[PDB]
Amino acid sequence: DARQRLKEVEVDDNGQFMTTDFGGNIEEQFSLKAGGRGSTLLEDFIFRQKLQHFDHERIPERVVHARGAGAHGIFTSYGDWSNITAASFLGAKDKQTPVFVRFSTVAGSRGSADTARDVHGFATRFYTDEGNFDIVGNNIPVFFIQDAIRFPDLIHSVKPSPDNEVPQAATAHDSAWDFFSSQPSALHTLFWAMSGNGIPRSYRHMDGFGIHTFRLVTEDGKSKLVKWHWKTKQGKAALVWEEAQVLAGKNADFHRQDLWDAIESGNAPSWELAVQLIDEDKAQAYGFDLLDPTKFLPEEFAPLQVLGEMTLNRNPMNYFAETEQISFQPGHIVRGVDFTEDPLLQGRLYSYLDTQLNRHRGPNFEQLPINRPVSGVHNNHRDGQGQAWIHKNIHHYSPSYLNKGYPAQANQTVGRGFFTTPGRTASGVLNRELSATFDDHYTQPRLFFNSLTPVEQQFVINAIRFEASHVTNEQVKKNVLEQLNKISNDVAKRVAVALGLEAPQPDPTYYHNNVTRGVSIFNESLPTIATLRVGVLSTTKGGSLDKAKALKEQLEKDGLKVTVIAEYLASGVDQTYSAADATAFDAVVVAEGAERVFSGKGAMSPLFPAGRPSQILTDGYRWGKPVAAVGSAKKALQSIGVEEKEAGVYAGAQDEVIKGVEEGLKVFKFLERFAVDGDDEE
């Protein structure tokens, strides 16, 4: 149990009487009043201590990544990696370290939709025996900007306009695209956010990236440059934008429920921890500066080397005390790892320490149960708001004769202390510049786009088309066009069509045809269909429900989560048509006999909105999901104009439908149903 250390602070209220926060049993359902219908007394200490705690429940949301969810788990190392790092948690085969991971979006506030289009956070804490080590990552390997001092500008431009606070959780407005086109470094991450990475199917279907080049350091002090990767064992998978939008309204907790259900049902998700390793003397040897956070390292140049695997198997007990209160920091570093001169990472180190003082209203936030290490804290820090400990050492200073030198200094050779990479040097003038090696803002965006499938490329273009069409200012849109044209003339011309702007002329300085692996989502089927959702649309009339039950039981044998849907909650029905939507499922199957609710009287009922079963089937097909119908229910396929032998469409008896649906869930999205530019011309 990864939460084992947290059980000492867990409070069980069952079987007990109500109390105040300072003890004493009470009743707290009536205010103390001066007379039968009199005014409430100031001396009602019970009322005041109850309402004051309610009044003070909220803490500030995170300044970025305010919307997200998390879970506990275990990380297991696959070997003794002392040959590359002194990091304790990687020092032996099958060594296990408790983790907590929080996934998130970036721009939206606390109550915004999971399926907004956005970069996604992927923050992992290792509770190692030599301190907490945090990898505060994203599901995209490059970031918008090259210097941390520009972070407020980026975030202000993509967060709501400061006059009306419109729009929520979205880059589709003037200020954001004004910034993307005025700061061309941002276009690489923008392309990633405009792809499937911006609308993933779940937290469990994302890769993770530390983005920055870090350093692994051995006991003798030798170092190597390193990139952190998390590779999902569930496979990468993404939605389509028109589906993500409906899902934002139908279930804004789609992603956090996904992770919770997967863990509750015993299908804990896993990611493998992998690294790219680079010699120090090759930091600038691959066509870009490895200090540049707007660049990723093509796997053709440095392949991923798996070090271990992380499994998230325990949900939190109290979301606020654990998920909301946890405080990640890239400054949470340990012996065996070091920073680099990445100007974006450099400022992060200051920013995450500082912002905790705003979120937690004091300096003792590492004493919170979810932030505490398991390795012990011994120093001369004292006092501060909410000090939860009572220190014994009264000589709280160093050096000291009176405390005998304890707590004692630890460094590279004594006490396994942290040490900066010994060979690191500084050379040159103090400057407020960026290295000229950071100047190329277009080559890698072109590289990313080249490496996507044709329909995947169309998704990127259609996302940009959707986003840029919200920009009111004409010049901003033309500025966007000029910047896009430096990535690819074809992308600019296809985006320009939606904008009503003239197709720009080629500017080939950065054009190229190179491609790289690992970057696509839709060119690979899932390695497993466990936890994937199947909506079975049935009816309470006739014998349809009995068949849906058998259809459900066999589908569950393969590890799928099946929801039987009908007019009302008859025996065996999991959900009503009124409460059902196609966004909640990865495949839709119409049970035999349920074709009655797709036409005629059966489709017009007071118990669900008009056309709901037809709409669920239409949404699922148009959003590329595997859809099916058993036996006579093929008439439902007919009523929305879907043909039986289309790709990802399955009609027949129960068993062939079951096999066809499960095969289609591996494909996940059938991209034959999405038009590409040039298809419609006569």
**What residue 456 binds from ligand [O], a copy of itself, ligand HEM, none (CB within 5 to 8 A, per partner kind)?**
none
Least distance between ligand HEM and beta carbon 124 (Å): 9
* Given 6, 69, 87, 148, the residue binding ligand HEM (CB under 6 A): 148
Stretch that binds ligand HEM, among 85-93, 251-259, 345-353, 596-604 (CB under 6 A): 345-353
Q: Does 64 bind ligand [O] (CB under 6 A)?
A: yes
Distance in angstroms (rounded) separating the CA atoms of residues 626 and 666: 10
Site string for a copy of itself, 205-224 (x = CB under 8 A): --------------------
- How far from the centroid of its chain's Cα atoms is residue 166's Cα? 23
* Given 167, 331, 347, 407, the residue binding ligand HEM (CB under 6 A): 347
Site string for a copy of itself, 239-278 (x = CB under 8 A): -xxx--xxxxxxxxx--xx--x------------------
Residues of this chain, 186-225, that bind ligand HEM according to CB under 6 A: 211-212
Other CB atoms closer than 10 Å to residue 553's CB: what's the count? 10
Q: Measuring CA to CA, which residue among 180, 155, 182, 159 is closest to residue 170?
A: 159
Contact 308, 251 (CB under 8 A): no
* Given 348, 549, 625, 669, the residue binding ligand HEM (CB under 6 A): 348
Contact 652, 661 (CB under 8 A): no
Cβ burial, residue 192 (10 Å; 0-12/13-18/19+)? buried
Cβ burial, residue 416 (10 Å; 0-12/13-18/19+)? middle
DSSP per residue, 475-519: HHHHHHHHHHHHH-HHHHHHHHHHHT---PPP-GGG------SS-
324 secondary structure, DSSP code:
I
Contact 217, 86 (CB under 8 A): yes
Q: Which is nearer to a copy of itself, 161 or 450 (CB)?
A: 161
Residues of this chain, 29-88, that bind ligand HEM according to CB under 6 A: 51, 55, 62-65, 68
Active-site option among 65, 205, 255, 360: 65
| Inter-CA distances, 586 with 22, 74, 268, 415, 590, Å | 50, 28, 19, 53, 14
* Given 1, 4, 92, 165, the residue binding a copy of itself (CB under 8 A): 165
Q: What are phi and psi of 37, to 5 degrees?
A: -120, 50
| Sequence-ordered list of residues with C-beta below 8 angstroms from that of 279, at least 6 positions apart, any chain | 224, 225
Across the strands, what pairs with 125? 100, 134
Distance in angstroms (rounded) separating the CA atoms of residues 74 and 80: 17
| Residue 127 is labelled as binding a ligand | no
Q: Does 328 bind ligand HEM (CB under 6 A)?
A: yes
Q: Does 135 bind ligand [O] (CB under 6 A)?
A: no
Contact 86, 129 (CB under 8 A): no
Collapsed DSSP state (helix, strand, coil) of residue 308: strand
Stretch that binds ligand HEM, among 6-14, 306-314, 340-348, 417-425 (CB under 6 A): 340-348
Q: Does 620 bind ligand HEM (CB under 6 A)?
A: no
Question: Is 380 considered catalytic here?
Answer: no
Q: Measuring CA to CA, which residue among 326, 347, 374 is closest to residue 434?
A: 347
Q: Which is nearer to a copy of itself, 470 or 635 (CB)?
A: 470
Q: Which is nearer to a copy of itself, 12 or 281 (CB)?
A: 12
Least distance between ligand HEM and beta carbon 523 (Å): 25
* Given 126, 127, 151, 448, the residue binding ligand HEM (CB under 6 A): 151
Q: Which is nearer to ligand HEM, 343 or 593 (CB)?
A: 343
**What residue 293 binds from ligand [O], a copy of itself, ligand HEM, none (CB within 5 to 8 A, per partner kind)?**
ligand HEM
**What residue 104 binds from ligand [O], ligand HEM, a copy of itself, none (CB within 5 to 8 A, per partner kind)?**
ligand HEM
Q: Which is nearer to a copy of itself, 35 or 645 (CB)?
A: 35
Stretch that binds ligand HEM, among 301-309, 347-355, 440-448, 648-656 (CB under 6 A): 347-355
Residue where the block lists tokens 């229910």? 633
Residues comprising the chain, all counted: 682
Q: Does 111 bind a copy of itself (CB under 8 A)?
A: yes
Q: Which is nearer to ligand HEM, 26 or 155 (CB)?
A: 155
Distance in angstroms (rounded) separating the CA atoms of residues 96 and 92: 9
* Given 317, 515, 530, 667, the residue binding a copy of itself (CB under 8 A): 317
Q: Which is nearer to ligand [O], 344 or 447 (CB)?
A: 344
Site string for a copy of itself, 69-98 (x = CB under 8 A): x-----------------------------
Least distance between a copy of itself and beta carbon 461 (Å): 8
Distance in angstroms (rounded) separating the CA atoms of residues 142 and 293: 6
Read off the tokens for 199. 């609308």
Q: Measuring CA to CA, which residue among 329, 668, 327, 681 is closest to residue 521?
A: 668
Helix (H) or strand (E) holding 348: helix 343-360
Cβ burial, residue 73 (10 Å; 0-12/13-18/19+)? buried
Contact 616, 535 (CB under 8 A): yes
Residues of this chain, 340-399, that bind a copy of itself according to CB under 8 A: 341, 343, 346-347, 349-351, 353-355, 357-369, 371, 373-399
Q: Does 351 bind ligand HEM (CB under 6 A)?
A: yes
Question: Is 65 considered catalytic here?
Answer: yes
Least distance between ligand [O] and beta carbon 173 (Å): 20
| Inter-CA distances, 677 with 69, 226, 455, Å | 38, 40, 10
Active-site option among 132, 138, 197, 313: 138
Binding site for ligand [O] (CB under 6 A): 64-65
Annotation: binding site for heme:
352
User: What residues act catalytically?
Assistant: 65, 138
Binding site for ligand HEM (CB under 6 A): 51, 55, 62-65, 68, 102, 104, 121, 123, 136-138, 143, 148, 151, 211-212, 293, 327-328, 344, 347-348, 351-352, 355-356, 359
Annotation: binding site:
352
